[PDB]
A and B are shown apart, each in its own frame.
Chain A
Amino acid sequence: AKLHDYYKDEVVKKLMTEFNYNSVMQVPRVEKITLNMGVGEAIADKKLLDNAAADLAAISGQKPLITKARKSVAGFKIRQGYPIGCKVTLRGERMWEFFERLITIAVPRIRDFRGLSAKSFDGRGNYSMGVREQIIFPEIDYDKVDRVRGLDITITTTAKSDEEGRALLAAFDFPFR
C-alpha cells in the first residue's frame, strides 16, 4: 500500500479542491486492476497456455484464470468450453503494488515510447490499454521465456465519467499527452 497511503494524503484533497465534490469519498479510487491476456492459439497448442499462465503469474504475483470459450465461433474455429484466455483481478495492497511497479519501472521500459493515450476511457472513466511486448516486466527472466506475449490492462474505477477519471490518473502522474 506504498501508493495507497500516497493516494489518501494528497490526491483525495487535490481532487476535492479543483472539482468541488461534496463528500470526500466522491473522490474516486481505483477498485481493481484486471490482468487479461487472451492467447487465441491454445487450439493449436494447449501447452503454450500453461506456459502463458506461468508468465502472467510471474509478472503479477497471482494465479491467472483460464477463461472458457463461452460460445462457439466458427470464424476462429472455437467451440464453447475451450480454454482461450488468461485473467487476474487485483484489489487492495496487491493492486497498489502492481500499479506502482507498472508506472515507475515498466512504463518507462516501453519500446518506441511516446507515452499513453488519454482517449481509451469507454466513456465511463474506466481505462483499458494494451502493452505491445511482455519482457518489459523485470519479474520474468529475459532469455528464459519462449516468446513475447503482450496483454491488456484495464483500470476499473468507481468514477462515473472520463473527466474525473483523468483527474484520478493525472494525480498519480499517469503518462498523459
Chain B
Amino acid sequence: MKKDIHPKYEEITASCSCGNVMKIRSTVGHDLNLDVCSKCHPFFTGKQRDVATGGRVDRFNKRFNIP
C-alpha cells in the first residue's frame, strides 16, 4: 500500500441495537451504533424479526395505549 497518498485506515467497533458488537477495521473514522446487523435480520434465519426491537413503534403504542 502506498502510504502518503492513501487514506488513514484503522480499527473501529460497531454495535447493534440487539447488543451484538462486531470488531472490524474500516474508515468511518469513529465508532458507530448501528440498528440492524446480519444476525437480527428476517432473511438470515430471522425467527425473531425486528418487531421485538423497539423504537418509534413503542412511542406510538405507549402514546395510544389501546389494545
Contact = CB atoms under 8 A, between A and B. Distances in A.
24 contacts: A2-B24, A57-B7, A58-B27, A61-B7, A63-B5, A63-B6, A97-B24, A97-B26, A100-B24, A101-B24, A101-B26, A104-B22, A104-B37, A105-B14, A105-B34, A105-B38, A108-B37, A108-B38, A108-B43, A113-B43, A138-B14, A139-B26, A139-B28, A175-B43
Nearest to B28: A139
B9 A61 contact: yes
A173 interface: yes
A62 to B, nearest CB: 8
A100 B23 CA distance: 11
B37 A61 contact: no
A163 B45 CA distance: 23
Contacts of A2: 23-24
- Dominant secondary structure at the B interface: loop
B44 A173 contact: yes
A147 interface: no
Given A57-B7, A63-B5, A63-B6, 20 more contacts: A61-B6, A61-B7, A61-B27, A62-B6, A97-B26, A101-B26, A103-B38, A104-B22, A104-B37, A105-B14, A105-B38, A107-B38, A108-B37, A108-B38, A109-B36, A113-B43, A138-B26, A138-B32, A138-B34, A139-B26
Interface of B: 5-7, 9, 14, 22-28, 32, 34, 36-38, 41, 43-44
Interface of A: 2, 57-58, 61-63, 97, 100-101, 103-105, 107-109, 113, 115, 138-139, 173, 175
Given A63-B5, A175-B44, A105 B37 contact: yes
B24 to A, nearest CB: 6
Contacts of B37: 104-105, 108
Contacts of A173: 44
B14 A108 contact: no
Given A58-B27, A97-B25, A100-B24, A108 B32 contact: no
Nearest to B42: A113
A57 B9 CA distance: 11
